[PDB]
Design a protein around this motif. Structure first.
Motif, PDB file in Angstrom:
ATOM      1  N   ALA A  69      -4.223  -2.923  -2.684  1.00  0.00           N
ATOM      2  CA  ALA A  69      -3.645  -2.189  -1.561  1.00  0.00           C
ATOM      3  C   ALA A  69      -4.646  -2.077  -0.418  1.00  0.00           C
ATOM      4  O   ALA A  69      -4.296  -2.280   0.755  1.00  0.00           O
ATOM      5  CB  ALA A  69      -3.185  -0.805  -2.017  1.00  0.00           C
ATOM      6  N   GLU A  93      -4.867  -5.445   1.214  1.00  0.00           N
ATOM      7  CA  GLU A  93      -3.707  -5.691   2.064  1.00  0.00           C
ATOM      8  C   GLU A  93      -3.835  -4.963   3.393  1.00  0.00           C
ATOM      9  O   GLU A  93      -3.487  -5.509   4.447  1.00  0.00           O
ATOM     10  CB  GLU A  93      -2.430  -5.254   1.351  1.00  0.00           C
ATOM     11  N   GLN A  94      -4.313  -3.719   3.360  1.00  0.00           N
ATOM     12  CA  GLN A  94      -4.523  -2.992   4.607  1.00  0.00           C
ATOM     13  C   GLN A  94      -5.566  -3.687   5.477  1.00  0.00           C
ATOM     14  O   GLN A  94      -5.408  -3.770   6.699  1.00  0.00           O
ATOM     15  CB  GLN A  94      -4.927  -1.548   4.316  1.00  0.00           C
ATOM     16  N   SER A  99       0.826  -1.202   0.000  1.00  0.00           N
ATOM     17  CA  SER A  99       0.000   0.000   0.000  1.00  0.00           C
ATOM     18  C   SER A  99       0.863   1.256   0.000  1.00  0.00           C
ATOM     19  O   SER A  99       0.567   2.220  -0.713  1.00  0.00           O
ATOM     20  CB  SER A  99      -0.942  -0.009   1.202  1.00  0.00           C
ATOM     21  N   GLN A 116       3.983   1.513  -1.155  1.00  0.00           N
ATOM     22  CA  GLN A 116       4.623   1.618  -2.462  1.00  0.00           C
ATOM     23  C   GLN A 116       3.650   2.144  -3.509  1.00  0.00           C
ATOM     24  O   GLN A 116       4.010   2.994  -4.333  1.00  0.00           O
ATOM     25  CB  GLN A 116       5.171   0.257  -2.890  1.00  0.00           C
ATOM     26  N   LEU A 117       2.414   1.643  -3.495  1.00  0.00           N
ATOM     27  CA  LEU A 117       1.418   2.106  -4.451  1.00  0.00           C
ATOM     28  C   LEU A 117       1.073   3.570  -4.227  1.00  0.00           C
ATOM     29  O   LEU A 117       0.913   4.325  -5.190  1.00  0.00           O
ATOM     30  CB  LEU A 117       0.165   1.242  -4.370  1.00  0.00           C
ATOM     31  N   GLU A 120       4.026   5.606  -5.607  1.00  0.00           N
ATOM     32  CA  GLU A 120       4.049   5.638  -7.065  1.00  0.00           C
ATOM     33  C   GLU A 120       2.899   6.469  -7.619  1.00  0.00           C
ATOM     34  O   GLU A 120       3.069   7.194  -8.609  1.00  0.00           O
ATOM     35  CB  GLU A 120       4.018   4.219  -7.628  1.00  0.00           C
ATOM     36  N   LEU A 121       1.724   6.383  -6.994  1.00  0.00           N
ATOM     37  CA  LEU A 121       0.583   7.168  -7.447  1.00  0.00           C
ATOM     38  C   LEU A 121       0.847   8.659  -7.300  1.00  0.00           C
ATOM     39  O   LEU A 121       0.533   9.439  -8.205  1.00  0.00           O
ATOM     40  CB  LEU A 121      -0.673   6.764  -6.675  1.00  0.00           C
ATOM     41  N   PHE A 140       8.938   1.286 -11.223  1.00  0.00           N
ATOM     42  CA  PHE A 140       8.334   0.340 -10.287  1.00  0.00           C
ATOM     43  C   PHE A 140       7.941  -0.957 -10.982  1.00  0.00           C
ATOM     44  O   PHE A 140       8.199  -2.052 -10.463  1.00  0.00           O
ATOM     45  CB  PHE A 140       7.117   0.976  -9.616  1.00  0.00           C
ATOM     46  N   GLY A 171      -1.305   1.688 -13.689  1.00  0.00           N
ATOM     47  CA  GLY A 171      -1.288   3.005 -13.075  1.00  0.00           C
ATOM     48  C   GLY A 171      -0.093   3.242 -12.179  1.00  0.00           C
ATOM     49  O   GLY A 171      -0.236   3.818 -11.095  1.00  0.00           O
TER      50      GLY A 171
END
Lengths: 52, 41, 380
Positions: free
Chosen positions: C267, C270-271, B29, B31-32, B35-36, C320, C315
């Motif tokens: 994400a 995962e949280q 989360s 890392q995303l 990057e976002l 990455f 996105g």
């Protein structure tokens, strides 16, 4: 209760909300129960049209 | 036919763990999110 | 059907309190304290206080201890009355009640020994099944792997001798929960998909929680055709997901190849998964497997694609996606190779004949090692 017209209407409503919830088998079962109860009473034109 | 000439000299988990599990890194989360916000501007 | 004792919500709240970022949380503390004071749970109060270095309230602890003592005296009196005046059924019921109270007040070893004694005195097969299910619930509450395995084997054997479909379905739910606990996601997905239509073990978790677990585990386990047939087109699953927009979006983004939304939802998942008491150690593994699954699914339809195309689809940035792709190829998870000069990923999926030949070489090598070992053993 023996008021089977209201039972038919409620069963149709249950089938409608099941179909709106994407639970197709449950909607089909509710519709089949509604039809079985409908072929035991006088269905007004509105009720028969909703059934169809 | 034991080999007695060579002497025979917490984390008790059953699942098989792959090498990447040991690798340390920030949460996906984070890392995303990074990057976002990097590609947003 | 079965009683909610012990409450798995208590275990979830305790794990959440043990988490660093939720250690300072108050709402978890309030809910856990309310549960304990509604249940008068003194030994588990002491265990939690010593594990979390909490300040024990002497008045509340003494009141809980006195209530537990007088209640235990009452159950002992009822047991003696049943022994003196009634038959074995009433003494059996009294002993089950004593064991149930011991498990309720948070005693682990006392509940274990009381339930074992009851099982020794238990004759009715349904009551043996109920006691084994209680032991399984206790093991799940304390994450006791040996206890869970032994009680699962006992329940399976008992059902094989005589098993009603209700208890078999409940055992399927318990087995799926344990398989989730041990990262055996394929079996967990199998069991959860088998039990989603007839889920009745509400003591373990609510229907929505069970369905979220089923969706997650089926996503990580099933391939695309099975996922589409059993999960995407699942009737009950879709019905409940109508009330869970986040889980529905997470599930449908991967199936519809909406990879950026899928990554954002992953994400979020995962949280959610980090805080879960049962999916705790496998959240990194689940996330990595989902990332690998998405990358492989995208690369299945392409022979050579620009890195910018993946960066736009998921996105993310070029760097990455390049780093993640390189790490996953280095681990031998994706059948592709990267041309960084042109920034193009070219898939290296073996054809049917090449894959068949490699599988033949591997299996034949194993079988020939076995044959050589056997022959050298027997020919002296």
């Amino acid at each position: 209760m023996d008021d089977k017209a209201l039972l038919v209407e409620v069963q149709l409503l249950e089938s409608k909300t099941y179909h709106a919830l994407s639970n197709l088998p449950k909607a089909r079962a509710a519709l089949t129960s509604a039809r079985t109860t409908a072929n035991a009473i006088y269905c007004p034109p509105k009720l028969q049209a909703t059934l169809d | 036919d034991e080999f007695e000439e060579f002497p025979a000299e917490e984390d008790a988990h059953v699942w098989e763990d792959n090498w990447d599990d040991d690798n340390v890194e920030d949460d996906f989360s984070n890392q995303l999110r990074a990057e976002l916000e990097k590609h947003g501007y | 059907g079965l009683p909610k004792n012990p409450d798995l919500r208590i275990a979830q709240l305790r794990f959440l309190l043990s988490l660093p970022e939720h250690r300072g949380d108050a709402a978890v503390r309030d809910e856990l304290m309310a549960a304990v004071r509604d249940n008068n749970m003194a030994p588990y109060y002491e265990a939690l206080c010593k594990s979390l270095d909490w300040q024990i309230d002497v008045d509340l602890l003494n009141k809980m201890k006195k209530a537990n003592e007088d209640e235990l005296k009452r159950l002992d009196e009822e047991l003696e009355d049943a022994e003196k005046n009634l038959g074995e059924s009433e003494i059996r019921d009294a002993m089950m009640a004593k064991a149930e109270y011991l498990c309720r007040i948070g005693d682990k070893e006392g509940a274990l020994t009381a339930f074992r004694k009851t099982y020794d005195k238990t004759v009715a097969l349904g009551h043996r099944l109920d006691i084994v299910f209680y032991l399984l619930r206790i093991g799940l509450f304390y994450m006791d792997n040996d206890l869970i395995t032994r009680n699962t084997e006992k329940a399976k054997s008992l059902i094989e001798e005589g098993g009603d479909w209700d208890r078999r379905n409940r055992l399927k739910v318990y087995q799926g929960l344990y398989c989730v606990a041990i990262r055996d996601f394929k079996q967990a997905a199998e069991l959860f998909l088998d039990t989603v239509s007839t889920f009745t073990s509400y003591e373990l978790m609510d229907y929505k929680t069970f369905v979220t677990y089923t969706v997650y585990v089926s996503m990580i386990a099933l391939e695309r055709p099975d996922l589409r047939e059993k999960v995407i087109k699942g009737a009950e699953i879709l019905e409940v997901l109508h009330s869970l927009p986040a889980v529905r979006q997470y599930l449908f983004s991967l199936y519809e190849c909406r990879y950026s939304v899928f990554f954002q939802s992953l994400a979020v998942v995962e949280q959610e998964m980090k805080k879960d008491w049962l999916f705790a150690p496998h959240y990194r593994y689940y996330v990595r497997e989902m990332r690998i699954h998405a990358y492989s699914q995208l690369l299945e339809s392409y022979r050579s694609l620009t890195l910018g195309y993946m960066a736009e689809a998921f996105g993310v940035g070029v760097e990455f996606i390049d780093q993640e792709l390189s790490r996953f190829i280095a681990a031998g998870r994706l059948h592709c190779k990267i041309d960084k000069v042109n920034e193009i990923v070219e898939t290296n999926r073996p054809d049917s004949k090449n894959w068949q030949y490699q599988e033949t070489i591997k299996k034949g090598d194993l079988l020939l090692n076995r044959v050589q070992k056997l022959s050298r053993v027997i020919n002296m």
